[PDB]
């Protein structure tokens, strides 16, 4: 066996690394967490520090509130019985208001009110988490790519739980909080819209989802294949092309007739991924607002 570089043969530790400072407010960083030797076979061994300023606390607080609101409902459905709680965990479900409440807050707690409370908490958890994504990059002087990409995922989420429900005139359209119930909702969504396999945005979203696995398999394997020339030091390969970056390009040029650069592969990357949820949100948002049945729409539209 050549060694394959999937796991490290030797770990090496030094002083806890407290990171770069730039414009970060340091009063907001924890200290370092412990070191995981377990993790260190595969990635970095070090845990933390983490930064938690105000927006981070806010986000984490609603996040947990969203989670606890759901879990209290679950416990209730379980009749406060721990054994029934574990037995039926995947079956419980926090459902939105029935259609007749429309977009209002008039519905009872036990029949939608709670769903709206949990959703409110989710809304602020995520958008504050987005803000934090933008802010931690700014403090460090970095591009805003992470936040722009996160926004593509937030787009699908918004469409599912907020924008499409509002356009359709009721909260009853949104996704319930439960393990099995959300799968049921997904299957139902497709049946009721005459089979999402005919939504061309759905087909596109799939091509990107498969394409992301294709591309990360390609890229992950490529970088490991040239890691014996320092391939994974991609920033310095961008600044000053090495043999790693040349052998990687040429593997692809010789295989399929064209290739990327060390920087440009990351642009192929971010876009293959982001287009999953972008075309996805479009396909969902059109469903039942403009197109009631995709099989039908497809008969009229190539």
């Amino acid at each position: 066996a050549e060694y394959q570089n999937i796991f490290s043969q030797v770990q090496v530790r030094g002083p806890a690394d407290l990171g770069m400072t730039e414009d970060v407010n340091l009063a907001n960083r924890s200290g370092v967490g412990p070191f995981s030797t377990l993790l260190g076979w595969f990635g970095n061994a070090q845990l933390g520090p983490i930064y938690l300023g105000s927006l981070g606390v806010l986000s984490l607080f609603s996040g947990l509130m969203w989670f606890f609101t759901i879990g209290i409902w679950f416990w209730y459905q379980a009749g406060w019985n721990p054994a029934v709680f574990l037995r039926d965990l995947f079956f419980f479900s926090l459902e939105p208001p029935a259609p007749e409440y429309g977009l209002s807050f008039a519905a009872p707690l036990k029949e939608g009110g709670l769903w709206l409370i949990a959703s409110f908490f989710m809304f602020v958890a995520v958008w504050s988490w987005w803000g934090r994504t933008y802010l931690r990059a700014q403090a460090l002087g970095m591009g805003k790519h992470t936040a722009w990409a996160f926004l593509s995922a937030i787009w699908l989420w918004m469409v599912l739980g907020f924008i499409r429900p509002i356009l359709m005139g009721s909260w009853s359209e949104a996704v319930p909080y439960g393990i099995f119930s959300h799968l049921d909702w997904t299957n139902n969504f497709s049946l009721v819209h005459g089979n999402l396999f005919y939504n061309p945005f759905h087909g596109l979203s799939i091509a990107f989802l498969y394409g992301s696995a294709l591309l990360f398999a390609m890229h992950g394997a490529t970088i490991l294949a040239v890691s014996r020339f320092g391939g994974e030091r991609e920033l310095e390969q961008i600044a000053d092309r090495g043999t790693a970056a040349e052998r990687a390009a040429l593997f692809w040029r010789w295989t399929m007739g064209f290739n990327a650069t060390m920087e440009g592969i990351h642009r192929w990357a971010i876009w293959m991924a982001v287009l999953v949820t972008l075309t996805g949100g479009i396909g969902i948002l059109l469903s039942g607002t403009v197109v009631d049945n995709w099989y039908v729409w497809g008969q009229n539209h190539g």
Binding site: N5, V84, H145, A149, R241, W254, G257
Partner: protein
């Protein structure tokens, strides 16, 4: 015809079969014995598809569809116009995929790089073989395979899944999906991170991988690192396809009822099976 840096790498050697016979390029493409093999298998397959097109009616890409033998034929051969073209085309397809992997191996050897790419591609090929070969064979007929057509192959996915109820409930499929979604999450984060470092705020100097580790420690308390993230994308991807192939090879063979009912093993565990309340009592 060459990249500016390309010449020094185009030396003889690396080939697995043929010595120097096919050791050359056409424009950008390396050839090798396995480039000849892939051209042959692929050209034949495409020809037979064009033939099969005629035997069926159309030249519309949205209509051309090549169906395997009907179930009546079992695992035997079949007249060409009734499933045989399919069988031959399937052999061509596999022949082309495996040839393409082996040609990728030849390019690795010439370039002095590891074999991770063909090794990864082999997982795609195995999933394909699961659908067209392993599963049909375990089930007793070619006709359980999917047909080759843009839209008809989707019909088969939908039909096959609804044979077992909502296919969401297949637990290996759950894991597969999880890997797909996580892979795409990782891929977005990866591309975004490197680019955010290489393209910083206007006028600033390029960041370093230290900034990349810092960004992520700041954000979630952990950073997997620049080796790790490439390990991770490769693993998430291959694990998605591995579980995909798993979720299908077990369906119609060891499990053939409605997948939602499989989950009863959990709810019927003696300690809690009969306790009243909740959803299942």
């Amino acid at each position: 015809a060459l990249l500016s840096f390309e010449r020094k790498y185009r030396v003889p050697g690396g080939t697995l079969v043929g010595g120097n016979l096919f050791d050359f390029w056409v424009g950008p493409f390396y050839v090798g014995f396995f480039g000849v093999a892939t051209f042959f298998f692929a050209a034949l397959g495409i020809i037979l598809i064009a033939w099969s097109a005629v035997l069926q009616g159309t030249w519309n890409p949205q209509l051309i569809s090549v169906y395997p033998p009907a179930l009546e034929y079992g695992l035997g051969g079949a007249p060409l116009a009734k499933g045989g073209l399919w069988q031959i085309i399937t052999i061509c397809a596999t022949g082309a995929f495996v040839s393409w992997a082996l040609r990728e191996v030849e390019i690795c050897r010439k370039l002095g790089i590891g074999y991770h790419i063909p090794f990864a591609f082999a997982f795609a090929i195995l999933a394909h073989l699961t659908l067209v070969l392993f599963r049909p064979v375990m089930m007793g007929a070619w006709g359980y395979a999917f047909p080759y057509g843009i839209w008809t192959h989707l019909d088969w996915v939908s039909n096959t899944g609804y044979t077992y109820g909502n296919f969401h409930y297949n637990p290996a499929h759950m894991i597969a999906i999880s890997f797909f979604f996580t892979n795409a999450l990782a891929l977005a984060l990866h591309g975004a991170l490197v680019l955010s470092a290489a393209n910083p705020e206007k006028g600033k100097e390029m960041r370093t991988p230290d900034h990349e580790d810092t960004f992520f420690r700041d954000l979630v308390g952990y950073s997997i690192g620049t080796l790790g993230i490439h390990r991770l994308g490769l693993l998430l991807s291959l694990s998605a396809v591995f579980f995909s192939a798993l979720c299908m090879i077990i369906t119609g063979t060891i499990w053939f009822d409605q997948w939602v009912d499989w989950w009863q093993w959990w709810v019927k565990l003696p300690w809690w099976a009969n306790i009243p309340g909740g959803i299942n009592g």
